Nucleic acid binder design. Sequence first.
DNA 1: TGTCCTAATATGGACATCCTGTG
DNA 2: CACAGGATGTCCATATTAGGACA
Lengths: 84, 85, 89
Amino acid sequence: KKTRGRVKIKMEFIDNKLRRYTTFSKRKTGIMKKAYELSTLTGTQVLLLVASETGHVYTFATRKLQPMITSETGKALIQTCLNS
Amino acid sequence: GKKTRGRVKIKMEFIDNKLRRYTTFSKRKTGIMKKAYELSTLTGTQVLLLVASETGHVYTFATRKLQPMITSETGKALIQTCLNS
Amino acid sequence: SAITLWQFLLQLLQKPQNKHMICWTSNDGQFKLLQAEEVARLWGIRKNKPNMNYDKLSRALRYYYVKNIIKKVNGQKFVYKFVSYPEIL
DNA sequence: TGTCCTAATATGGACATCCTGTG
DNA sequence: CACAGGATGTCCATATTAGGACA
């Protein structure tokens, strides 16, 4: 009645520069929440890396996988992938 | 009453039960990978997810440009190096 | 209609009419699935799972193994046992 | 991002489904 | 076969998310 509720949106790239962003920031906090829940609950190594259109890179990495994004050998391979 | 208890809220700590834990690991890993895809495609962004089973299987989702990080020699050794120290 | 295998199985072990299908093979819990496939047939009717069979039912039984409810009996075909019997009742 | 309202989902628990492997 | 044990799906019922609109 009041609000339309959570709309069932199509799993296709959002085109409205604004919405997209709004979604991006929400799902991001959410998925990271998950990587933490999954990590924690089952105590399993987990690595999560997300990079926004700006290029800002966000990550979650359990104790052991940390090197994957801290070391220079890794921090390198990454910048390297986000290219062409 | 109802047929099942339905979804029941759990403490957010470590699961001591090897089976409840194992079951839960699948259920989640099944969904997190989903989210990764969604976020990835929903907002057209690169996403690298990497889940390591308590046993040994390494489930992973990665967008095209990131693929070279779980498909490349360096990545594989690096991922591999990151799991035995 | 909330029922679990171990409940259902027991429910069969308390009805005489079901003695040549499933019967106690001891007084301290051990029991045998004489007509295994049939029990399965019925159990898939209790849960509304048409394509049910012993190769699927037993798998539930094996899960019960570690959950410390029902253990196999090495050697004896189709013979299992409740571990907390007659406590379970 | 931070809520609110509200529908869309994710997913605990209990098996069901497939499958690989074994004497 | 008859039995073990693993990964993933299903069904019920309810615990968590996240589209819109607006700050």
